[model samples]
Target: KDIATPIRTKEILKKYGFSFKKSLGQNFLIDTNILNRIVDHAEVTEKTGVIEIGPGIGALTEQLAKRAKKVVAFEIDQRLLPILKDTLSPYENVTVIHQDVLKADVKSVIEEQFQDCDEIMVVANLPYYVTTPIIMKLLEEHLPLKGIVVMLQKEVAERMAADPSSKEYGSLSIAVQFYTEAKTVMIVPKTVFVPQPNVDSAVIRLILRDGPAVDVENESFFFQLIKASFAQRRKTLLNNLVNNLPEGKAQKSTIEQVLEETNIDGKRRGESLSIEEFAALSNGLYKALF
Candidate 1:
């Protein structure tokens, strides 16, 4: 009777004549055990409200609806709306909204959907192609989310939760860690999907911070500085700063002075700096350069 079982899902698809659209990156989960683990990691309870993206065939949606107080899912594929309604009909608490999640004003949607609910969490199996922008928007918009537990390509997850001195550490690592406490909670095998993905997936839990991990002079500048530092991972921090920052060559000496005052060695690579160190560097550069 569960929607996630392989046989049941195939039967539903057959009934609806629904076929997977590879262009949309459709891959429905057919394993209930992994579904339960995803929800469990989100710490979903009767009290939590969840916003889901890409609820293909309502598999993960069904699981969240069963555990959370209310579940609001944004399904971009119009073809899947009726199928979702049919599969998710048993759960009265579910609301299926047909809209591209990136284009939708999620803040307003949450206001309309979960006014009675206190804590909201985002729990979804995001498409591999568009994972970073979606997660970045959710973080940048300062959504009222308690946390997010999302399944994405394992390689990307490693970078998002990566720490200093690791090959995976880059601008993305600093960008995500600055806003939330990130950790890869579980690795999901490829065998669970109706159409197996080429790569393994992992679930990363991002607990929203009360405030950004560090205080800096300018948020935009801080992020830009991070991107510049990693523009060429092989370049030394001083060389990267001079090469990437706007009019950086013109301000080379000032950059050197700031680096000296910040006490970060110029010979170090971008991956070696922690978010706290980045914050310190960003603050110094903002004043010196701008």
Candidate 2:
């Protein structure tokens, strides 16, 4: 009787006369097993509070509602409000807010919604086009979250969980890993969706850390330096820094000296450098430049 089953999903869609909106990246899950597993991966408990984005037809919302103390979902599409109201009516614990999650104040929402719940996690099947921004915002805002378990494009999940020297390791890998432990829990096939997407998806669990992975004098400078170092994949670390950073060419000699002091090979590509090394390099650069 769950909303995730194929027949149930189709029947609900028919009843609502709902058509898929391509621009919204609206592909609803139609497999109950997958839905159950997603909740399992989230490690939902009776005390856990969940914030879900893009709860299409309340498939995943219904699943979360059954486990967590309360489930608050943000749906951007106005049409889905009625559909969700009808579908999620059985679960008095679920609340569907009609607002784009990207623009919404999630921290305030969490404060207001989950006052009685101690732990909170973001569990969502995020829209493909806006995944990076959404994840980055959630991390940067420094919310009091237990963890985030989300389903996203397979390649993106790999990049977030990638290690040093791997092809997928880049600024994004460093950026995401800086705040949490990123792991790809499972891969989901495209066939599980009603209107199958072009690519497979993976469930990624990001457990927030007590502090950042490494310490640096200036976090902003550290992030900026990481981006500069990875500006050109084929370029050497020294060349990338000198070419990409502001006034970097004029201070090339200082950069070279700092690299030697940090014991980092200027000839090495950014991909070869680990997060710790990047931290050391950024600190050295900050002390020298700023």
Candidate 3:
């Protein structure tokens, strides 16, 4: 309970010589109210098994363990291990694995430890640098994960939950929305951390769907085309396709013709296209490419 403050985190950091690394997105949440709020909205109960990422000093970790059936946390920084062990020692259901969360096979690990549970919830104060990739992997891998409640940079959270045709709508938006229903639960202030972040953050919750929201004939090609389309945001869809595809494949004129056939604007930016429209483009390209 005493470990819930920034002063305590600062003391532990000083003891372990752990300076917050800006590159790692190490802004630890210090506000107890916000910490509890995150846990509360996470909906952790005696039936819940939660996987936490970057559990710095066990602030949220402690709260989660108090209510959840079990809490498994992955910490990349070894320096915080002793601090977490000390802070979380009283909780019998908590396990802190010292490893990079991204590098580890989370799906297998969850299966091995929590096989009895059909669905597990993920909660984390994610590293900003790898936020998109990490979330994408978890959602894409078909881990029996029910949902994710994450603390992310406010801008990134907005982009994830952005609607189709919005400025924030892009590849990340489509990818996330395709697999999960994401919404921001709360916005956190910069002052809630020991070393306050330059920008504010938000709590985003994503409920995984049973399957993709839309039907696609070629799922792999659909994603590939989506990635290619946004490779150059400023470039037109035709130019992006020309740059993304292999040499001697899908000439600009052909791409334009395909766009015309699909009734999509050739000059429109990738951000303006919805997931369904992209799927249609990918389907048309699949016919053209093969």
Candidate 4:
């Protein structure tokens, strides 16, 4: 039952009278080739447990099932429940849970259901509206994940995998790269989806690092400083520090010395600094502030 084929997808949708919710950012893939390719990029094996988000009509879910030892999908829509049950009926390894993945406790779910499955991978065609939050949550939770391979807005994929000096780079790049090695493996055309999205998509692989990319005095403070550095994108790092940091507003002299002592030029903009530089800067600030 080639679910991803355009003709088959339409037939299934019509059969179930399935109407996509634009609010949910619903766009189902109509190309089996892309579906298969997405599964391929995840490197799913018989021993792998696949965690999928928003498995619209079970198209990608079906593909994951064929390769993974277990596939647990979270579907927020009640309308697709019966449809998924019928379409994925042949795949005994797939479990469709009716819940919003972002709100649901993914770590607990994985620990309980996928403990024996080993090498858990989050494989999904994520909705554009909530891509960053979802990715950040998955990474920040410190789950026992082998990696995450997801299809996201192309620009986002670029930014995630972007180098520090590129226009695509920002705090997001530093944050994501701090946890994993990100790579854009494929650029997908918008025409392949059933309803078609406004923008093109790309598949990105985020291989979890054994530890945080750089050592910091305070993990929370490190991230806060990263964000503060980029708070006003056009502002110089020192100017942003003066404006955004808690004690910065009244302490220009101290911040200047801190930057001078750390050997970072106060004239340099935030975007010009790399993750390692940010780590060093944050640690310097931690010491200076204390």
Candidate 5:
């Protein structure tokens, strides 16, 4: 299958004098079947112009390029560049850029290369260390992305798709759920890679919503309110705010007055508040703070 063509098995690695770089989070997927299924889950087609991160050895990249209109792959490891140059040489639409995906300006990169394309989708076997940050950045920037399908640690995937009021629900869940609809697409075993990861992996699909889930007068302030609430998860709202506020900015009496005015329980913890409730508290505090 096209998806399996660029597999970096031990034999292939030996041929190219390749050794996995620990710092780059190199775990090359050699399973063609799983690769094809991931592409299917992503819904990549001939019209899709896809952005791929950490395309180690180009296993998934080859698959995406063959099926999609074009694939813009960001590879942080320079060691794999020569290998990619040879493996992806025949496909004129595949551009393997040498740069860190997190630092790269994806919007400009996409606009520059794929201005004619209508929709963009992101796919990656993301490193576990920076998975959350990368996804958060993509969503926060409001990129013209149709969707994102990524391979992540199973535990993290569950958290991303966790529902409100669930034990796994937290700030990450609320933040992601506010903008996109997320779900687990598939689970990948550790043995699929040349150097298997210790933990199991899963694929997550995030379809960007047309607009934010909730309306807020001040988005930045709303986040601050949420942070203040969660500042000390064990403490009550009054206690948390009193402790978190800059010295002399908000006294306990003033905080209690603000909570009373907002009709929020002074004993409430930050994790218990809904996004709507947070917005309300932010509006109330905006008046009190300034």
Candidate 6:
């Protein structure tokens, strides 16, 4: 059975009497070519394990099973479980867990499921609303991952791959870049879905680095400082730091002192600084302020 075919998908939905849930941001892939392309772009091998998020109707799961050593999917909605069991029964390598990827212990899951495998390639079609949290969770958890390749909102993909001085650059850019070398592999149109999304999507490949791009004194404080820096984009780094940070108003002098010590212009906005500069500023501030 061609699971990705429009006719097959319609038949399955009809048999199950499934209705689309907007809350889940459910959009199943009807294009077999695109499904295969995503798997190919992820660089999955017979030895690689793939962790999938929101495998609606097991469309993409079918493709991954043909290529990867194992495919473990996290499906939040209960409605999709039985359908997935039936659809994916032909493949023994695929495992579907009923849990939310954001709250679930991903590191434990990977360690438990992919015991023989040292690392995994996380591949998913992530929803827009939960994209940042999911990516940050996966990165912050510091799982033993080979990398992550995901389809998210196009603008987000651009932001992840954006340069320091680009309009799309911000805390997210720094956060994502701190962990991986991000690149947008392909553009997927919105029209390909059952209930089409308003915006187009892009496949972004995040090749995990052995260590962060830059070393800072405190990783949590470093991210906190970055979040404060971009709290208000129009505000200067000093202004943002003062406004968003705790005791920031009282610590203005110390903040200024560290800015001067780090030689980062207080007048410049957060978007102007690269990850290296952010690292330096964060380390400096960690000592002087945070």
**Candidate 1 residue lDDT tens string, 1-290:** 78999998888878876444545566889999999999999999998999999888889999999999999999877778878878988999999888988888989999999987879999999877789989988888888899989999998899999887777989999899989999999999998887888767899999999998899999889999999999999889999999998858999999999989989998998767888899999999998786
Candidate 3, 188-269: lDDT as tens digits: 8888886788877898999999899777778777877888889999888777888887621447677778899999986888
Compare candidates 2 and 5 on lDDT and give the better one: 2
Stretches of candidate 2 off by over 4 Å are: 15-20, 246-254, 287-290
> Cα miss at 252, model 2 (Å)?
4.6
| Candidate 5, 1-290: lDDT as tens digits | 34353344555566766444556466778888898899999999888999998877678888898889999998876778777886677788898888887788888898887876778999999878889889988887888999999998998989889887787776677777777999988989888876778877899999999998887776666666666667778778777777776621446677678789888997877778887877777777777776
Which of the predicted structures, 1 or 6, would earn the higher TM-score when compared with the native?
Answer: 6
Kindly provide the TM-score of model 6 when superposed on the true structure, using C-alpha atoms. 0.94
The residue-by-residue lDDT of candidate 2 on 1-290, one tens digit each, is 88988899889988876444545577788887897898999899999999998888888999899999999999887888878878899998998888888788889999989997879999999867888889988898889998999999999999999987678999989999999999999999998887888878899999999999999898889888999999997889999999999959989999999999989999998778888999999999999986
With candidate 3 superimposed using the best TM-score fit, by how many Å does residue 100's alpha carbon deviate from the native? 2.5
What TM-score should be assigned to candidate 3? 0.89
Full ranking by TM-score: 6, 1, 4, 2, 3, 5
Clashing pairs in 6: none
The residue-by-residue lDDT of candidate 6 on 27-65, one tens digit each, is 778888998888888888888999999888888899999
Model 2 TM-score? 0.90
Kindly list the per-residue Cα lDDT of model 4 for residues 60-130, writing each as its tens digit. Answer: 89888988999999888787877887889999899888888878888889987796796999999887888
Provide the lowest-lDDT 10-residue window in model 3.
Answer: 16-25
Alpha-carbon deviation at 108 in model 4, angstroms: 1.8
Q: What lDDT score is found at residue 25 in candidate 6?
A: 73
Q: For model 4, what is the C-alpha lDDT against the true structure?
A: 0.87
